[PDB]
Scaffold this active site. Structure first.
Site, PDB file in Angstrom:
ATOM      1  N   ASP A  35       0.818  -1.210   0.000  1.00 11.07           N
ATOM      2  CA  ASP A  35       0.000   0.000   0.000  1.00 11.07           C
ATOM      3  C   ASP A  35       0.856   1.265   0.000  1.00 11.07           C
ATOM      4  O   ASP A  35       1.445   1.633   1.021  1.00 11.07           O
ATOM      5  CB  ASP A  35      -0.973  -0.006   1.190  1.00 11.07           C
ATOM      6  CG  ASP A  35      -1.864   1.232   1.239  1.00 11.07           C
ATOM      7  OD1 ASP A  35      -2.173   1.804   0.173  1.00 11.07           O
ATOM      8  OD2 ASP A  35      -2.309   1.706   2.304  1.00 11.07           O
ATOM      9  N   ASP A 220      -1.768   5.189  -5.468  1.00 10.85           N
ATOM     10  CA  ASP A 220      -2.177   4.303  -4.387  1.00 10.85           C
ATOM     11  C   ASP A 220      -2.385   2.864  -4.848  1.00 10.85           C
ATOM     12  O   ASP A 220      -3.410   2.533  -5.449  1.00 10.85           O
ATOM     13  CB  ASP A 220      -3.454   4.852  -3.741  1.00 10.85           C
ATOM     14  CG  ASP A 220      -3.784   4.190  -2.414  1.00 10.85           C
ATOM     15  OD1 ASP A 220      -3.087   3.232  -2.015  1.00 10.85           O
ATOM     16  OD2 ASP A 220      -4.738   4.566  -1.698  1.00 10.85           O
TER      17      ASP A 220
HETATM   18  C1  FRP Z   1      -7.178  -3.249  -2.554  1.00 10.31           C
HETATM   19  C2  FRP Z   1      -8.266  -4.026  -1.844  1.00 10.31           C
HETATM   20  C3  FRP Z   1      -9.665  -3.665  -2.350  1.00 10.31           C
HETATM   21  N1  FRP Z   1     -10.045  -2.443  -1.645  1.00 10.31           N
HETATM   22  C4  FRP Z   1     -10.459  -2.635  -0.253  1.00 10.31           C
HETATM   23  C5  FRP Z   1     -11.735  -3.477  -0.283  1.00 10.31           C
HETATM   24  C6  FRP Z   1     -12.962  -2.653  -0.610  1.00 10.31           C
HETATM   25  C7  FRP Z   1     -10.009  -1.256  -2.267  1.00 10.31           C
HETATM   26  O1  FRP Z   1      -9.650  -1.167  -3.428  1.00 10.31           O
HETATM   27  C8  FRP Z   1     -10.358   0.020  -1.559  1.00 10.31           C
HETATM   28  C9  FRP Z   1     -11.502   0.762  -1.852  1.00 10.31           C
HETATM   29  C10 FRP Z   1     -11.746   1.950  -1.157  1.00 10.31           C
HETATM   30  C11 FRP Z   1     -10.850   2.399  -0.184  1.00 10.31           C
HETATM   31  C12 FRP Z   1      -9.698   1.659   0.092  1.00 10.31           C
HETATM   32  C13 FRP Z   1      -8.703   2.077   1.134  1.00 10.31           C
HETATM   33  O2  FRP Z   1      -9.078   2.773   2.066  1.00 10.31           O
HETATM   34  N2  FRP Z   1      -7.438   1.657   1.011  1.00 10.31           N
HETATM   35  C14 FRP Z   1      -6.389   1.974   1.982  1.00 10.31           C
HETATM   36  C15 FRP Z   1      -5.579   0.681   2.162  1.00 10.31           C
HETATM   37  C16 FRP Z   1      -6.423  -0.544   2.475  1.00 10.31           C
HETATM   38  C17 FRP Z   1      -6.038  -1.777   1.953  1.00 10.31           C
HETATM   39  C18 FRP Z   1      -6.785  -2.924   2.222  1.00 10.31           C
HETATM   40  C19 FRP Z   1      -7.927  -2.846   3.019  1.00 10.31           C
HETATM   41  C20 FRP Z   1      -8.317  -1.616   3.547  1.00 10.31           C
HETATM   42  C21 FRP Z   1      -7.565  -0.471   3.281  1.00 10.31           C
HETATM   43  C22 FRP Z   1      -5.517   3.116   1.443  1.00 10.31           C
HETATM   44  N3  FRP Z   1      -4.897   2.735   0.190  1.00 10.31           N
HETATM   45  C23 FRP Z   1      -6.316   4.408   1.269  1.00 10.31           C
HETATM   46  C24 FRP Z   1      -5.523   5.664   1.620  1.00 10.31           C
HETATM   47  C25 FRP Z   1      -6.112   6.876   0.902  1.00 10.31           C
HETATM   48  C26 FRP Z   1      -5.527   5.921   3.103  1.00 10.31           C
HETATM   49  O3  FRP Z   1      -6.544   5.748   3.750  1.00 10.31           O
HETATM   50  N4  FRP Z   1      -4.363   6.346   3.606  1.00 10.31           N
HETATM   51  C27 FRP Z   1      -4.071   6.660   4.902  1.00 10.31           C
HETATM   52  C28 FRP Z   1      -5.000   6.577   5.941  1.00 10.31           C
HETATM   53  C29 FRP Z   1      -4.631   6.919   7.242  1.00 10.31           C
HETATM   54  C30 FRP Z   1      -3.334   7.346   7.515  1.00 10.31           C
HETATM   55  F1  FRP Z   1      -2.984   7.678   8.771  1.00 10.31           F
HETATM   56  C31 FRP Z   1      -2.403   7.436   6.485  1.00 10.31           C
HETATM   57  C32 FRP Z   1      -2.775   7.091   5.189  1.00 10.31           C
HETATM   58  C33 FRP Z   1      -9.463   0.478  -0.599  1.00 10.31           C
END
Ligand code: FRP
Length: 373
Positions: A35, A220
């Site tokens: 990530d 991301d």
């Molecule tokens: C890829 C798997 C498939 N999924 C999850 C299943 C629906 C997605 O595609 C998906 C869809 C919507 C949102 C997110 C999402 O929140 N992903 C997270 C990572 C993650 C990965 C797996 C499980 C849940 C979370 C980040 N990559 C998001 C970033 C912006 C962020 O929060 N950073 C951030 C937050 C706080 C901080 F202190 C510093 C930094 C992921």
């Protein structure tokens, strides 16, 4: 060697890409999600209905308690954990062992995915957005500090079970064709880039370029879809909707709720537009565009019919260049030179008449015109 790191990422479509890691002594094998959108190294440390294995601090002799609680809220999902340090290795990465900060996940809400095969998250972004504060050294920072591994990593994410490559400490030249085009990292927190122009089917969206980066724009690997600010999403959907007027769609389709289906191999790819995201170059006259096909933003979902999910959603926290964007390209996270490189990946989706591309140069607006403050 870089050959040893090729094809080291695995995953399931829309469930994330993971890398194999070992933690503790003796080493505990765990699949860890890659990530670039966060900065915390966290692993499940307690039984969970979705976990097949977990980190056991009682079984590691090199485990050190930090006696500090930590909590990380993502855009979707969140976890709680106890902070500590232990010896970490990447078997299919560089042959080194490092002492890194590890958040031992004790409880979580909608974080882990059922049958995803990964047990933890590797936050590859910068200390600025690490929890609870920027004083907690992220993993990659620890790796660079303790070893001679160059301050650089590159991701080659391949689409349709999915595979990929995380080359730690450099660039593998067999994984991309053509030239690498670099865009500056605006600020060392997220991997923040600046989008200067958006074109759908050759037509400029004609929007104030500050809107494309409203709040921010980030690269991301821990997000599947391409995410755009409310205003930009509204304009983009209006373009794709109008380009594909021949076929009828359910209302929930554009919101990522409903699927559209066609006859086996009779998918009308041609009526769906290509999307060009123009990324600001290190020099403003050396800007470039990444073009993504409908095959990338129309993700396949499981009846002999071919069904697809609209993989563009709106955002409140700015543009998110997810897997959808990354999957067609070789993305180089050049931390040492404060820039991100894009090149056409070797594992690209092959359209009969069109091609995903990284093309330049282009003259665009700069940080003053497009950056949000
Ligand atoms: C890829 C798997 C498939 N999924 C999850 C299943 C629906 C997605 O595609 C998906 C869809 C919507 C949102 C997110 C999402 O929140 N992903 C997270 C990572 C993650 C990965 C797996 C499980 C849940 C979370 C980040 N990559 C998001 C970033 C912006 C962020 O929060 N950073 C951030 C937050 C706080 C901080 F202190 C510093 C930094 C992921």
């Amino acid at each position: 060697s870089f050959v040893e790191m090729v094809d080291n990422l695995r995953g399931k479509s829309g469930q994330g890409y993971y890398v194999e890691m070992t933690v503790g002594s003796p080493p505990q094998t765990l699949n860890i999600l890659v990530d670039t959108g966060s900065s915390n190294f966290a692993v499940g440390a307690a039984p969970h209905p979705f976990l097949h294995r977990y980190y056991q601090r009682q079984l590691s002799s090199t485990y050190r308690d930090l006696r500090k609680g930590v909590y990380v809220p993502y855009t979707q999902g969140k976890w709680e954990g106890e902070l500590g340090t232990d010896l970490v290795s990447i078997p299919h990465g560089p042959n080194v062992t490092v002492r890194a900060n590890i958040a031992a996940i004790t409880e979580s809400d909608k974080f882990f995915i059922n049958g995803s095969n990964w047990e933890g998250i590797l936050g590859l972004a910068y200390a600025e957005i690490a929890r609870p504060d920027d004083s907690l050294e992220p993993f990659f920072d620890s790796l660079v500090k303790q070893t001679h591994v160059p301050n650089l990593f590159s991701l080659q994410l391949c689409g349709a079970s999915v595979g990929g490559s995380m080359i730690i400490g450099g660039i593998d030249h067999s994984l991309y064709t053509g030239s690498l085009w670099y865009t500056p990292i605006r600020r060392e927190w997220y991997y923040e880039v600046i989008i200067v122009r958006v074109e759908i089917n050759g037509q400029d969206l004609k929007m104030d370029c500050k809107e494309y980066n409203y709040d921010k724009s980030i690269v991301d690997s821990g997000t599947t879809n391409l995410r755009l600010p409310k205003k930009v999403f509204e304009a983009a959907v209006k373009s794709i909707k109008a380009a594909s007027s021949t076929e009828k769609f359910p209302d929930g389709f554009w919101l990522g709720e409903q699927l559209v289906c066609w006859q086996a191999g009779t998918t009308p790819w041609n009526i769906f537009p290509v999307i060009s995201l123009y990324l600001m170059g290190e020099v403003t006259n050396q800007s470039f565009r990444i073009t993504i096909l409908p095959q990338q933003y129309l993700r396949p979902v499981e009846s002999q019919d071919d069904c697809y999910k609209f993989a563009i959603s709106q955002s409140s926290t700015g543009t998110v260049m997810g897997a959808v964007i990354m999957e067609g390209f070789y993305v180089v996270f050049d931390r040492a030179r404060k820039r991100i490189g894009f090149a056409v990946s070797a594992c690209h989706v092959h359209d009969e008449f069109r091609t995903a591309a990284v093309e330049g140069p282009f003259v665009t607006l700069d940080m003053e015109d497009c950056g949000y403050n």
